[PDB]
Design an enzyme around this catalytic site. Structure first.
Site, PDB file in Angstrom:
ATOM      1  N   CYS A 103     -36.658  68.743   6.939  1.00 30.70           N
ATOM      2  CA  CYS A 103     -37.523  69.874   6.663  1.00 30.70           C
ATOM      3  C   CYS A 103     -36.611  70.945   6.049  1.00 30.70           C
ATOM      4  O   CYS A 103     -35.790  70.625   5.193  1.00 30.70           O
ATOM      5  CB  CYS A 103     -38.251  70.306   7.920  1.00 30.70           C
ATOM      6  SG  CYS A 103     -37.232  70.429   9.451  1.00 30.70           S
ATOM      7  N   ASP A 109     -47.538  77.335   7.436  1.00 32.68           N
ATOM      8  CA  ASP A 109     -46.400  78.251   7.403  1.00 32.68           C
ATOM      9  C   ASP A 109     -46.009  78.751   8.792  1.00 32.68           C
ATOM     10  O   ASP A 109     -44.820  78.917   9.086  1.00 32.68           O
ATOM     11  CB  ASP A 109     -46.717  79.450   6.497  1.00 32.68           C
ATOM     12  CG  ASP A 109     -46.318  79.214   5.062  1.00 32.68           C
ATOM     13  OD1 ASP A 109     -46.076  78.055   4.717  1.00 32.68           O
ATOM     14  OD2 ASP A 109     -46.229  80.175   4.276  1.00 32.68           O
ATOM     15  N   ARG A 163     -39.624  70.568  12.634  1.00 33.78           N
ATOM     16  CA  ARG A 163     -40.586  69.549  12.225  1.00 33.78           C
ATOM     17  C   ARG A 163     -39.952  68.171  12.231  1.00 33.78           C
ATOM     18  O   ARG A 163     -40.575  67.187  12.666  1.00 33.78           O
ATOM     19  CB  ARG A 163     -41.128  69.866  10.825  1.00 33.78           C
ATOM     20  CG  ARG A 163     -41.914  71.140  10.817  1.00 33.78           C
ATOM     21  CD  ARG A 163     -42.410  71.517   9.433  1.00 33.78           C
ATOM     22  NE  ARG A 163     -42.600  72.958   9.344  1.00 33.78           N
ATOM     23  CZ  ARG A 163     -42.922  73.604   8.223  1.00 33.78           C
ATOM     24  NH1 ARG A 163     -43.097  72.940   7.089  1.00 33.78           N
ATOM     25  NH2 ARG A 163     -43.069  74.918   8.230  1.00 33.78           N
ATOM     26  N   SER A 164     -38.722  68.074  11.731  1.00 35.89           N
ATOM     27  CA  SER A 164     -38.051  66.786  11.650  1.00 35.89           C
ATOM     28  C   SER A 164     -37.893  66.181  13.043  1.00 35.89           C
ATOM     29  O   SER A 164     -38.072  64.970  13.252  1.00 35.89           O
ATOM     30  CB  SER A 164     -36.656  66.925  11.033  1.00 35.89           C
ATOM     31  OG  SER A 164     -36.682  67.279   9.687  1.00 35.89           O
ATOM     32  N   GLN A 201     -37.948  73.178  17.733  1.00 35.94           N
ATOM     33  CA  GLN A 201     -37.454  74.555  17.640  1.00 35.94           C
ATOM     34  C   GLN A 201     -38.254  75.556  18.462  1.00 35.94           C
ATOM     35  O   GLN A 201     -37.750  76.662  18.724  1.00 35.94           O
ATOM     36  CB  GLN A 201     -37.478  75.029  16.179  1.00 35.94           C
ATOM     37  CG  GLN A 201     -36.282  74.632  15.389  1.00 35.94           C
ATOM     38  CD  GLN A 201     -36.258  75.340  14.052  1.00 35.94           C
ATOM     39  OE1 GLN A 201     -37.062  75.047  13.161  1.00 35.94           O
ATOM     40  NE2 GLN A 201     -35.351  76.300  13.915  1.00 35.94           N
TER      41      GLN A 201
END
Length: 298
Positions: free
Chosen positions: A215, A181, A221-222, A262
């Protein structure tokens, strides 16, 4: 500069945040006019994450061709990826329409449906064989054929039927279920194991349309998935693998979709994944077995 020494240089000086802001500063900015049209407001999950007009995927329908998805074309690596947001309740049909129209063989999901107690994605695939999903707006049927659950990722075998022509296609769903998370995984072995499972399936290969990767927003993440795959493929190709500059590969990808990677931790993790993945690319085939052991996927 050998990225492994660049990595230690950055790590020792603790300048990951500074490198990351330099990337943010240099990154491309292109118009995203179609995404901001009022008729499309309910097709965007996040106000601040939009596809550029020049690289957006268009749906093959006359009413409204918009989906929040970008084609990332890596010419030297000979790789195409579609990066997209987690589908919304009202865009699940558009999502599968895109998969059909682009001839994708794989969908790569890097998030859980619920994280941090909030919904990040619609449940857009069926959870039981006998309970298929029908997307009335785009005239598609989707059936779960088989599921293969490992501790931190699941592979599903889906059948997608175009109800107009009754053609069917096998779609593979690769679901990485253990991204924490907060933050990033401590070791990438688990990351690399999953990537090389996707590769082995054929889903990234040029015989098929581009893989769909998402994602929740389709950028963090992607981005880490596409960046590591492309960097490893370039190191495989070129005569001088040390001439792979992760920062420049990331800036190239950001010509096609904003915001890829990110956080500075995700940037650091990307370096670690590529450095560790290199060991296999450069001829140590046994490292793949280790990652599988290190991943404790049983």
């Amino acid at each position: 500069m050998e990225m492994e020494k660049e990595f230690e240089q950055i790590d020792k000086s603790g300048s990951w945040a500074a490198i990351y802001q330099d990337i943010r500063h240099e990154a491309s900015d292109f118009p995203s006019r179609v995404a901001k049209l009022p008729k499309n407001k309910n097709r965007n999950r996040y106000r601040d994450v939009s596809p550029f007009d020049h690289s957006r995927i268009k749906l093959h329908q006359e009413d409204n061709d918009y989906i929040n998805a970008s084609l990332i074309k890596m010419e030297e690596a000979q790789r195409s990826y579609i990066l997209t947001q987690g589908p919304l309740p009202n865009t699940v049909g558009h999502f599968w329409e895109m998969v059909w129209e682009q001839k994708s063989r794989g969908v790569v999901m890097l998030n859980r449906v619920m994280e941090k107690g909030s919904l990040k994605c619609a449940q857009y695939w069926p959870q039981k064989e006998e309970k298929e999903m029908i997307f009335e707006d785009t005239n598609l049927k989707l059936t779960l054929i088989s599921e293969d659950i490992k501790s931190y990722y699941t592979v599903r075998q889906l059948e997608l039927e175009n109800l107009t022509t009754q053609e069917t296609r096998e779609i593979l769903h690769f679901h990485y279920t253990t991204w924490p998370d907060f933050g990033v995984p401590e070791s990438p072995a688990s990351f690399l194991n999953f990537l090389f499972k996707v590769r082995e399936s054929g889903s990234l290969s040029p015989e098929h349309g581009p893989v769909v990767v998402h994602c929740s927003a389709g950028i963090g993440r992607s981005g880490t998935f596409c960046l590591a795959d492309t960097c490893l493929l370039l190191m495989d190709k070129r005569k001088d693998p040390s001439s792979v500059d992760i920062k420049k590969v990331l800036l190239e990808m950001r010509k096609f979709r904003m915001g890829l990677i990110q956080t500075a931790d995700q940037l650091r993790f990307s370096y670690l994944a590529v450095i560790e993945g290199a060991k296999f690319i450069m001829g140590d085939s046994s490292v793949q077995d280790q990652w599988k052991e290190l991943s404790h996927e049983d």
